[PDB]
Design a protein around this ligand. Structure first.
Ligand SMILES: [Cu+2]
Ligand SMILES: [Cu+2]
Lengths: 117, 117
């Protein structure tokens, strides 16, 4: 059931305007995605029944979680509990790695199978 | 409760020779760490009752999972189910972000409270 995946510049897939996604790996309890986000894009306010914990690999965003707002730079991190409202403004081209728990089955369809193993 | 944390080069805790750790954030279902590893160090075989999913921010490691072995570089990722044998050889100075599920209570104390927003 273990997985390895290798980095590739290909197959980051459209999710929302300005936001591309790739599911890297997943398991019994978690699922890992990489989000590639264009400067000036945004994530609209949403909720989902998965805890979402992330790390900014590169760039700069403003991450809104309920009534908090924080500027996020490379190496910063966050944890958003299940069903909590969140959104973001993307200030520079940015890359984030985010892990969902429980496994977010709807995101398995973004798995880049050309780079698994 | 949601959580934000800011990057700091300080307060990594010695875990093994050449291997240091810091808990970045955690939540109800997950806990996120950053592993800073020195060229030439290693992790011996271990297992634990937490799923472990990781992303290599930088460097070069050989990651062993049961009878599999893979060289892992920046942007590669892995998911290791609960109780599965794994170890690693660190070939270059390396940095990994790893998320445990469920929340790994023993690692809460490695949070750097000076970086929590
Ligand atoms: Cu979300
Ligand atoms: Cu481990």
């Amino acid at each position: 059931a273990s997985m390895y995946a290798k980095h590739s510049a290909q197959n980051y897939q459209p999710l929302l305007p300005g936001i591309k996604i790739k599911t890297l790996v997943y398991g019994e309890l978690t699922l890992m995605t990489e989000f590639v986000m264009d400067k000036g894009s945004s994530l609209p306010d949403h909720t989902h029944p998965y805890e979402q914990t992330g790390y900014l690999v590169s760039g700069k965003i403003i991450l809104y979680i309920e009534d908090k707002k924080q500027q996020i730079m490379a190496g910063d991190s966050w944890c958003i509990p299940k069903n909590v409202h969140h959104h973001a403004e993307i200030l520079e081209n940015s890359v984030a790695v985010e892990v969902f728990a429980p496994t977010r089955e709807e995101y398995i369809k973004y798995l880049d199978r050309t780079t698994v193993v």
